[PDB]
Amino acid sequence: TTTVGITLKDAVIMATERRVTMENFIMHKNGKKLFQIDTYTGMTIAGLVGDAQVLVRYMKAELELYRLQRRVNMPIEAVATLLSNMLNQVKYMPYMVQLLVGGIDTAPHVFSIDAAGGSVEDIYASTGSGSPFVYGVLESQYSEKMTVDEGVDLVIRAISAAKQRDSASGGMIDVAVITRKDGYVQLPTDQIESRIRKLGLIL
Amino acid sequence: TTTVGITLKDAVIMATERRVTMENFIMHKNGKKLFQIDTYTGMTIAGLVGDAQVLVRYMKAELELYRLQRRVNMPIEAVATLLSNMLNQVKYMPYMVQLLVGGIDTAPHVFSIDAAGGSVEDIYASTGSGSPFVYGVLESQYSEKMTVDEGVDLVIRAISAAKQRDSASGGMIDVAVITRKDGYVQLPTDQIESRIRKLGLIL
Amino acid sequence: TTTVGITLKDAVIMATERRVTMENFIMHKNGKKLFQIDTYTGMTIAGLVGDAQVLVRYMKAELELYRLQRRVNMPIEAVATLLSNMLNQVKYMPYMVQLLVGGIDTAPHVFSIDAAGGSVEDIYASTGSGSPFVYGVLESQYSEKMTVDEGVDLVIRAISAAKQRDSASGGMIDVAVITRKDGYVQLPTDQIESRIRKLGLIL
Amino acid sequence: TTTVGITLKDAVIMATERRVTMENFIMHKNGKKLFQIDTYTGMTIAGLVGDAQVLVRYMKAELELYRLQRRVNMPIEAVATLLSNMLNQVKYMPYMVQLLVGGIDTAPHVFSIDAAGGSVEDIYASTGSGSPFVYGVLESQYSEKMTVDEGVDLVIRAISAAKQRDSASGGMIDVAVITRKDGYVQLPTDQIESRIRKLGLIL
Amino acid sequence: TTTVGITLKDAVIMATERRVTMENFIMHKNGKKLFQIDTYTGMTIAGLVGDAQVLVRYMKAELELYRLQRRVNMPIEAVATLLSNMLNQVKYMPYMVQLLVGGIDTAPHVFSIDAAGGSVEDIYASTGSGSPFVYGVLESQYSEKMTVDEGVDLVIRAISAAKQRDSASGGMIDVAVITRKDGYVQLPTDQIESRIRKLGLIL
Amino acid sequence: TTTVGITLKDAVIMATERRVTMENFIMHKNGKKLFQIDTYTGMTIAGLVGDAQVLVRYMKAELELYRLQRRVNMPIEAVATLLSNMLNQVKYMPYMVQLLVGGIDTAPHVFSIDAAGGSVEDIYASTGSGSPFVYGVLESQYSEKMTVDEGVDLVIRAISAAKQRDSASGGMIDVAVITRKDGYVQLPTDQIESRIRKLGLIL
Amino acid sequence: TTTVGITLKDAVIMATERRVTMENFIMHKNGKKLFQIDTYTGMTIAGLVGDAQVLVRYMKAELELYRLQRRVNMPIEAVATLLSNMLNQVKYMPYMVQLLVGGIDTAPHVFSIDAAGGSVEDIYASTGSGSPFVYGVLESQYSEKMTVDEGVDLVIRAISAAKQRDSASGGMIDVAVITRKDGYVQLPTDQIESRIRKLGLIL
Amino acid sequence: TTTVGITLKDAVIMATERRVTMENFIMHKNGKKLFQIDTYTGMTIAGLVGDAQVLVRYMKAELELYRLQRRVNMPIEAVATLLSNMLNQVKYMPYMVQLLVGGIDTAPHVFSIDAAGGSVEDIYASTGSGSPFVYGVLESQYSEKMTVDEGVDLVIRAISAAKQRDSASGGMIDVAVITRKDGYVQLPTDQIESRIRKLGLIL
Amino acid sequence: TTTVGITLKDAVIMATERRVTMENFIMHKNGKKLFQIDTYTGMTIAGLVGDAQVLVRYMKAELELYRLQRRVNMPIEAVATLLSNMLNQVKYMPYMVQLLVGGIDTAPHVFSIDAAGGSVEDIYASTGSGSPFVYGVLESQYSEKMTVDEGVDLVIRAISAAKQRDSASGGMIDVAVITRKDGYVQLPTDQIESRIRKLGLIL
Amino acid sequence: TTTVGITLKDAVIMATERRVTMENFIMHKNGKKLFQIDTYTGMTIAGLVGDAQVLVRYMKAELELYRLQRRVNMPIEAVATLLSNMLNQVKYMPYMVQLLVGGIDTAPHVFSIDAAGGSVEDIYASTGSGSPFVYGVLESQYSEKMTVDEGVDLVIRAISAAKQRDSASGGMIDVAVITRKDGYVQLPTDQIESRIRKLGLIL
């Protein structure tokens, strides 16, 4: 699996690929690993699929409830804290997952949450077996000054590089952009396919 | 075991064979592995027999109840979500199964659910020890543009190929076709035998 | 890895892909897995790379020597017997490989040799993590009556199917055709790319 | 450790960092991991330091001897084949190393050799705990049409990205360029420091 | 990780670095490991991140409640005693952490608390993989007679030495000074960077 | 154990303490861990005492032999290379030691050699359970511009700090200074005691 | 750790050192291991620091509660019986400690209690890693006829000997004398230091 | 077992007890553990009896042979070095012993040698299960200024203390005194009994 | 430990020694292992001290309560049956003890009870590590016709023999005699010493 | 098994029983465990029967050979030393035995030898599972002043007691008496039976 979240001035971009394997066996080429969980909040999943999917359901439900109760969206750090408590509480019988939570409240945020509920905010982060290849691309190419369009190109380049070198990663790249103006928006596939062409890449 | 489910424009086709083994020991040549669980919903089972049989009874019961309560059939994705929750909830004392759920709501769907409750939708899928051989056939021969008659021949070819190469697969091929127009129809054995002959296959 | 060897009336066709992994890590996209080891003899390798490479050097050396000593090529069954003895002799400190040996003497032959030196002749065979997918395609589509051009398309379809479903398989498909008339001929990459296009496949 | 070898039209560029660790303990900040082993041949070492250092001494001695006996330099592929044989011979009591061998004979070559003597030629390669980060950078940025100056900047960017994300990598970057015209040239430290400054990097 | 707490005549200085690793993988360069938990009380965390973060949340909440209930701040030794009880109570299912608690009541105090709830007061202490390097600097250089400015320089020197030799330590040094007069004051990054320059240090 | 070796302009200084333990049991307060092994060469030992003592005897004998045979002293890098070969040769049945070798040939050198024969030159190094505390002091206080008098005080400070924090270190500090002019000179105990007083230290 | 308790005609003397280790790492030089738990009752602790500290708090609380409820001090044998019951009740999830309880009711008493609640009265006893060295000194030098001044010298001699030979013992010696006349009296550090000087000892 | 060796101005005193156990079973009350191995050399044995007895025979033979060959007794440090070489040579199939060697050449010496051949000279030493009790007595009571008569009483006191606290020690105390004037002299049992009587001890 | 119980015409005699060990370490020379638990009932304990001490307290309490409730002493066989039930109830989390219960109701009885609650009446029995030595003495010397004075000498002989051969046994012999006429009588130490003297024994 | 050897003024008496078991299965009631190995030398065996029987054959052969070569009998201590050497030389692939060697040279001797070649002389000794019961009887009843007739009764009493309490001992008692006057004399069974009757014993 490869997922990534980056922050830019007033935006968050998250992206994944779609390959679901069992050992070397590619069971599904079109898994979904990127989810909207609130108006301006997204989550990516890596690890045990059943565990991750239960968590996505729980987050969609809890963040909706909270929003209705508080008349405001849960702050992104509160989403990460909630998840941190939940996962740590069962650390000895854990959700076998790595999660990214990205979103905008008064500021863009990406948090990386581990299976023991350890949660750390970063300017960008990546999870799954393909993450080291992503980190290479982002170390070399990320700039805090990038436009959303440049950030989208960057995550496409990073995930494409991971797909070339991580056999557990593959399939179409999914990308979401999160802004105060439009909230969470999953980019159309045609647009991502168009950028892959104009960047001169594969799959 | 070999089971398969494919989607076509307005149809789902699901098929299995019937061999039940205790290691190398063929105990039963005619086990049942394909079940109608709702008006337009079918399920196949692979893995531990007692576990799979309990889940078939549970699904038949629950979808009947849900239908009477809601006055509509459970959406196919809702079927897969329910199973997902059920299986993940006992992940440390699991149902040792692989399930395909297939059906028609507003559109055809096939879902593949694992023993930890991970559920993924696909255009086609296969489970059991025979599945790799099926995936070879489907990769080579499946087309989204196929008629129901072509899709029926396809699943027969795929499962017959698996029977040739997986010693845990064997016996008569069972096939169901699910459409909005005709509902869930299990094809008569005589029809499947006829196609096996006309395709130049065996059994 | 995926390798395949098929016999036809007066021909052997052998093919592989080229992906070399360290677990999920794709180290090399263009490894070589198909080798001419004698005038009318080819071998494919699967398993531990260093072990397989040593055996290729040993076979090239020994068949050249044998040819000069006997004034005729080692019969294909004799090639498989030699390897059989060699591999069984170190069965407790083994070469961790799966080998196909293919060639023409008075007739076409394909042999599959395992890490304990078990050798079995077959009309066709496949090795590596990708082999189950290949066996599906071959079971469904192979015919003893095929022309060389049809057999070449077949192995391309089989290996392309394996590449779609085995994450340890990937890269350009290499193909050799062996006949008494033309000897061992590795097909040019441009020819294989052309067939991949005309068959509606990828890469 | 991070090491990298790339090929360009008529050149090979090899580079490493210098950190030697014992678990988390940085024992030495300035170990040497890149060595000239023949007139136009270099080698990088990763893995167990004692094993790697013995192999460097063995290769320096043997290539000098070979050159004196043959009146020509050992071909690069011959160097890799020699290493393959040596390492595979002791597979069950191994040199726990990863090696890159790079150089010029009639053409540039880079080979990657593993602890079982598996050896594969590639247009570029990387070894050590930092390698996945390097592969990200190279996948995204490498071009076959690069000048030597561009190739040198590329390996510096790649190793710099690795140092940022791999705690087992660190220290000054060492770079050598190998050509027919100029031989094996280790770049001066002040030249690499200049490029680090100009590329906007650190350490 | 490296954290340190020292006492001086009427002050406590606590400091950490910010690196979060998974094995050799530097996932976050800017984790937070030093926290204000009461008006004149600070805590540092080392060990399993999810456990430590839960404890920081628990301590912030409890000390705030206690302050409102008692109308005085919890005594520093009472903070250590509370933690000692909580950690020992779950010692067979532990919080896998090392904690420093420092602050001022009628006098400065630093306490070090282990995963079994063992709590010992000291004039100075250090936790994390970098602590042995810190203890060398402190043994050689600490004086009970130091001024706050001298103590801040010392902790900076100590953590800088740890970052040079512990690959699990890194990033910017965070420092807090606690006094009766000024309360808990986290020093501005600019002030620490300036001290690093004047002391002639790196990373 | 704590040992240290540092290089200065035209000198090498090596030092150890003397404690020999069996677990917590202090068996000997006055073991010897610093040895002259050639005219301008010293060695320190850490690890399994019987192994280290055999190596000290082997080194004294071999360096004397070599000097008689070559009519020159073995170069310091040759001493380290010899040890490297010896230790690596038996890596699977090892000498369970860490060694420092220091001396003067055309220049000062210190090498650190591990139990697999990995040998690395450094400007300074430390071995034994007390080495991390030493590394703290050296990182903070070492300067390449120090006089011999200053270097002697430094090693005394570094070892004294180690004795305060490592219960497996203890007893009198032994120090040797190596120069071209004066050769290998073990400093008298009274001189070290005087320096211990003047520096304000213990034991 | 080293602790000791001896009885004399109308007195109990208890003493410990103060070193706290994790393996060879001396984390704390001034831990506290000797505690007043009632008017004429003391306790020493050895073993897991968190467990022992909990038990010190529990004993202080219960003995105070008991004294208030009964209007007399708990008899020393009753203190040991209470401890014996408590420790045995959790023997399968134990407090990993060794305890000495000493005091005066109608007579002086020392009891030694183990982690399974085994409790035995003795005229003298010692616990911790340093205890065997203490038993040597006491076997040779203890006399039931000693004055309090003589007994204080004896325990100081005993612990000093233990500190010389047990690397897990160290730091200042703490001594308490318990009499009916003066109650529990912890001896001032200056007095113990003066005795150490006068007896010709160290630390 | 308990053995001890001490040095005084011009004498060595060695002593043991005699108990031989098989776990708790006292098989023999009168084993011999102290042996004259040369004119002015003695040895004590602790550990596996059969191993120790072989070494006693080996040392008696070799020291006789050496004395006849060299016309001088082997120096005490040579004796320890010979043992060190012998034991270390077989360290993976070891003699499971602890040895003391004591004697007079130009000066008194006591060496303690472990099962891996580690050999350390000391002013005094003790081996066996009773050794910690001995070390307490020696730390408290040993003086370098002692007369032979005083040193004899000391070792009797030390072993008597060990016999009171180590159930694996027991039986009559054996004592030898070694001097240049008188050679190796094993004290008569009645003299040791008389000293036990006068010192106020048991057995 | 050694304990013994014998029956004679109208008497029971029970006896133990007093040694408490921690492996080879004689912690206590004067433990108590023989207890009066009712008017005419005694019990000895062997095994885990803390467990045995709890049971002593439990039996003293229950037999008092029963005597008050029933107005008669619990029959000796009832005492053994109560213990049998208690110990067996917790057999998977057991009291790790061996018990003898002896007494007079209408007749003398000795019962031996194991850690799983197996209870067997005998004319005599022995427990603890010293028991086999006791059984040799009793087999050879016990007569049912013995007087109380003879039976007392016998048990003293038996325990004295055990003390000579079992290093886990030692210290003063305790003896009680139980009769209807005189009740439970613990013999005075001076009477047992006088018998040890007259019988020609030790300790 | 039970065996015993005792010395008297001018005699050695040795005795065994005869039971051979596999677990609880009494396979043989009349095994032989006492052997004449030289003119005035006997041996008993305990442990693995095959190992012991080989050693009996080896000792008979070697002692006969030695007597013929030296023209005198091997001294009993020499017999034990030879055995000690032989058993120790194979200690890691041992003879799993316990041996008693008894005889007369210039004096009576009994030696006990273990499976690692540890050999100790004693006035009496016993081996086998029944030995602890024997030691009981001997501790109570052995006298150095006994006549041969008294010693024979003693060993019969001792083994009879062992047979009562050790289910691995049983069968007829075999006794041998060794004197200078009469040599090795195995007592007639009728004589031992008569003593058993007269002493009032069983079997």
Q: What residues form DSSP beta bridges with H7?
A: H12
Place of tokens 């049998």: I84
Interface of A with C in 105-144 (CB under 8 A): 129
Q: Which among D135, D139, D161 has CB closest to A139?
A: D161
- From F127, which residue of chain D is nearest by alpha-carbon distance? D27
Question: CA G93, CA G84: separation in Å to the nearest integer?
Answer: 15
Residue J148: count of CB within 10 angstroms of its CB: 17
CB G21 within 8 A of CB G9: no
Q: Measure F94 CA to nearest chain D CA, in Å.
A: 12
DSSP G69: H
Neighbouring C-alpha atoms within 13 Å toward the C-beta of F5: 31
> Which token pair is I132?
């086999």
Question: CA J163, CA J170: separation in Å to the nearest integer?
Answer: 5
Place of tokens 């059989």: C84
Residue I146: count of CB within 10 angstroms of its CB: 18
Q: Which among J133, J141, J157 has CB closest to I135?
A: J133
Question: CA G124, CA G8: separation in Å to the nearest integer?
Answer: 9
CB G11 within 8 A of CB G26: no
Question: Rounded to the nearest 5 degrees, what angle is found at the Cα of A162, between the Cα atoms of A160 and A165?
Answer: 115
Exposed / middle / buried, residue F190 (Cβ in 10 Å: 0-12, 13-18, 19+): exposed
Residue to substitute from F7, F122, F142, interface D, most D β-carbons within 10 A: F122
CB A105 within 8 A of CB A40: yes
- Among residues I2, I4, I1, the alpha carbon closest in space to that of I112 is found at I4
Which technique?
X-ray
- Cα–Cα distances (Å) from F192 to E98, E157, F148, F187, in that order, read 38, 27, 13, 7
CB G155 within 8 A of CB G11: no
Question: CA B121, CA F174: separation in Å to the nearest integer?
Answer: 73
CB A49 within 8 A of CB A198: no
Rounded to 10 deg, the angle between the F148-165 and E131-141 helix axes is 120
Interface of A with D in 149-178 (CB under 8 A): 157-158, 160-162, 164-165
Q: Which among H84, H112, H122 has CB closest to F53?
A: H84
- From E155, which residue of chain F is nearest by alpha-carbon distance? F140
CB F77 within 8 A of CB F109: yes
Q: What is the CATH number of domain H1-203?
A: 3.60.20.10
Instruction: Report CA torsion sign: F146, F148, F152, F153.
Output: negative
- From F130, which residue of chain E is nearest by alpha-carbon distance? E132
- From D163, which residue of chain E is nearest by alpha-carbon distance? E26
Residue H24: count of CB within 10 angstroms of its CB: 17
Question: CA J29, CA J49: separation in Å to the nearest integer?
Answer: 14
Chain J hits for I162, Cβ within 8 Å = 136
Length of chain B: 203
Neighbouring C-alpha atoms within 13 Å toward the C-beta of G182: 13
Neighbouring C-alpha atoms within 13 Å toward the C-beta of E47: 21
Task: Check F50 against H118: CB less than 8 A apart.
Answer: yes
Question: CA G63, CA G58: separation in Å to the nearest integer?
Answer: 8
Kindly give, in sequence order, each residue whose CB lies less than 8 Å from that of residue A1, ignoring residues fewer than 6 positions away.
A16, A17, A19, A33, A46, A47, A127, A128, A129, A130, A168, A169
Task: Check F165 against E135: CB less than 8 A apart.
Answer: yes
Q: Could you write out the three-class secondary structure of F94-112?
A: CCCEEEEEEEECCCEEEEE
* Terminal alpha carbon distance of chain C: 16
Beta strands in chain C (DSSP E): 3-8, 11-16, 20-22, 25-28, 34-38, 41-47, 97-104, 108-113, 119-122, 124-127, 174-179, 183-186
Task: Check D24 against E167: CB less than 8 A apart.
Answer: yes
Kindly give, in sequence order, each residue whose CB lies less than 8 Å from that of residue J23, ignoring residues fewer than 6 positions away.
none
Q: What share of chain B is helix, strand, coil (3-state, %, to 5)?
A: 35, 30, 30
Q: Measure F166 CA to nearest chain G CA, in Å.
A: 5
Q: Characterize A4-43 residue by residue with b for buried, 16 or more Cβ atoms within 10 angstroms of its Cβ, and e for exposed.
A: bbbbbeebbbbbbbbbbbeebbbbbbebebbbbbbbbbbb
Kindly give, in sequence order, each residue whose CB lies less than 8 Å from that of residue E9, ignoring residues fewer than 6 positions away.
E108, E144, E145
Does E188 contact G at CB distance below 8 Å? Answer: no
> Which token pair is G45?
């602790």
Round the CA-based radius of gyration of chain F to a whole number and report it.
Answer: 16
CB H7 within 8 A of CB H108: yes
Q: Characterize B38-59 residue by residue with b for buried, 16 or more Cβ atoms within 10 angstroms of its Cβ, and e for exposed.
A: bbbbbbbbbbebeebeebbeeb
Interface of E with D in 28-47 (CB under 8 A): 29
Q: What residues form DSSP beta bridges with I71?
A: none
Residue to substitute from B123, B124, B126, B133, interface C, most C β-carbons within 10 A: B133
- Among residues J62, J63, J115, the alpha carbon closest in space to that of J87 is found at J115
Which residue blocks in J90-188 are alpha helix, DSSP H? 131-141, 148-165
Which chains does B contact via 3+ CB–CB distances below 8 A? A, C
Kindly give, in sequence order, each residue whose CB lies less than 8 Å from that of residue D54, ignoring residues fewer than 6 positions away.
D95, F84, F85, F88, F117
Q: How many CB pairs under 8 A join D and F?
A: 45
Task: Check B165 against C136: CB less than 8 A apart.
Answer: yes
CB B7 within 8 A of CB B123: yes
Q: Which of J1, J2, J41, J127 is catalytic?
A: J1
Per-residue DSSP letters for chain E?
Answer: --EEEEEETTEEEEEE---EEETTEEEES----EEEEETTEEEEEEE-HHHHHHHHHHHHHHHHHHHHHHSSPPPHHHHHHHHHHHHHHTTTS---EEEEEEEESSSEEEEEE-TT--EEEESEEEESTTHHHHHHHHHHH--TT--HHHHHHHHHHHHHHHHHHBTT--SPPEEEEEETTTEEEEPPHHHHHHHHHHHT---
Let me know if chains E and G touch, i.e. at least 3 Cβ pairs under 8 angstroms.
yes
Q: What residues form DSSP beta bridges with A122?
A: A110
> Which token pair is F41?
């060469």
> Which token pair is D94?
């191994």
Chain I hits for J160, Cβ within 8 Å = 139-140
Q: Which among I133, I157, I160 has CB closest to J132?
A: I133
Task: Check B118 against A27: CB less than 8 A apart.
Answer: no
Q: Measure H191 CA to nearest chain G CA, in Å.
A: 20
CB G91 within 8 A of CB G117: yes
Give catalytic status of residue E1 as yes or no: yes
Exposed / middle / buried, residue D77 (Cβ in 10 Å: 0-12, 13-18, 19+): middle
> Which token pair is I117?
């609650």
- Cα–Cα distances (Å) from E155 to D113, E196, J111, in that order, read 46, 11, 69
> Which token pair is G28?
């704390």
CB C50 within 8 A of CB C147: no
Chain H hits for G4, Cβ within 8 Å = none
- From F129, which residue of chain E is nearest by alpha-carbon distance? E132
Which chains does C contact via 3+ CB–CB distances below 8 A? A, B, D
Which chains does H contact via 3+ CB–CB distances below 8 A? F, G, I, J
Question: CA H128, CA H112: separation in Å to the nearest integer?
Answer: 12
Task: Check C165 against B132: CB less than 8 A apart.
Answer: yes
- Among residues A128, I202, D7, the alpha carbon closest in space to that of C24 is found at A128
Per-residue DSSP letters for B57-83?
Answer: HHHHHHHHHHHHHHSSPPPHHHHHHHH
Chain C hits for A21, Cβ within 8 Å = 167
Q: Characterize A147-167 residue by residue with b for buried, 16 or more Cβ atoms within 10 angstroms of its Cβ, and e for exposed.
A: ebeebbbbbbbbbbbbbbbbb
Q: How many CB pairs under 8 A join C and D?
A: 45
- From C32, which residue of chain D is nearest by alpha-carbon distance? D120
* Terminal alpha carbon distance of chain J: 15
Residue H22: count of CB within 10 angstroms of its CB: 13
Task: Check I24 against H166: CB less than 8 A apart.
Answer: yes
CB F45 within 8 A of CB F202: no
CB D111 within 8 A of CB D101: yes
Q: How many CB pairs under 8 A join G and H?
A: 58
Instruction: Name the residues of I annotated as catalytic.
Output: 1
- Among residues F130, D168, F141, the alpha carbon closest in space to that of E132 is found at F130
**H/E stretch holding D55:** helix D49-70
Kindly give, in sequence order, each residue whose CB lies less than 8 Å from that of residue D109, ignoring residues fewer than 6 positions away.
D7, D12, D76, D77, D102, D103, D121
Q: Measure C166 CA to nearest chain B CA, in Å.
A: 9
Question: CA H27, CA B193: separation in Å to the nearest integer?
Answer: 85
> What resolution does the deposited structure have, in angstroms?
1.9
Chain H hits for F25, Cβ within 8 Å = 132
Exposed / middle / buried, residue C23 (Cβ in 10 Å: 0-12, 13-18, 19+): exposed
- Among residues H63, H12, G28, A89, the alpha carbon closest in space to that of E58 is found at A89
Residue A182: count of CB within 10 angstroms of its CB: 10
Exposed / middle / buried, residue C113 (Cβ in 10 Å: 0-12, 13-18, 19+): buried
Question: CA I187, CA I150: separation in Å to the nearest integer?
Answer: 14
Task: Check H20 against J120: CB less than 8 A apart.
Answer: yes
Q: What residue segments make up the domains of chain I, in order of their start?
A: 1-203
> Which token pair is F116?
């697999």
> Which token pair is D195?
């490029």
Task: Check E20 against A84: CB less than 8 A apart.
Answer: no
Question: Rounded to the nearest 5 degrees, what angle is found at the Cα of B82, between the Cα atoms of B78 and B88?
Answer: 140
**H/E stretch holding H179:** strand H174-179
Chain E hits for G60, Cβ within 8 Å = none
Q: Which among A24, A129, A166 has CB closest to C166?
A: A24
Question: CA D4, CA D155: separation in Å to the nearest integer?
Answer: 7
Q: Which of E1, E2, E3, E7 is catalytic?
A: E1
CB G164 within 8 A of CB H134: no
Exposed / middle / buried, residue F67 (Cβ in 10 Å: 0-12, 13-18, 19+): middle
- Among residues D85, H81, E53, D152, the alpha carbon closest in space to that of A114 is found at E53
Question: CA H121, CA H124: separation in Å to the nearest integer?
Answer: 8
DSSP H171: S
Q: What share of chain I is helix, strand, coil (3-state, %, to 5)?
A: 35, 30, 30
Task: Check F25 against H132: CB less than 8 A apart.
Answer: yes
> Which token pair is H177?
């005194």
- Cα–Cα distances (Å) from E70 to E75, E100, E184, in that order, read 11, 24, 20
Which phi-psi region, left, alpha or beta, contains residue B117 (left: φ > 0; alpha: ψ -120 to 50)?
left
- Among residues I179, I203, I200, I176, the alpha carbon closest in space to that of I188 is found at I176
Q: What residues form DSSP beta bridges with A186?
A: A176
- From J134, which residue of chain H is nearest by alpha-carbon distance? H27
- From J132, which residue of chain H is nearest by alpha-carbon distance? H25
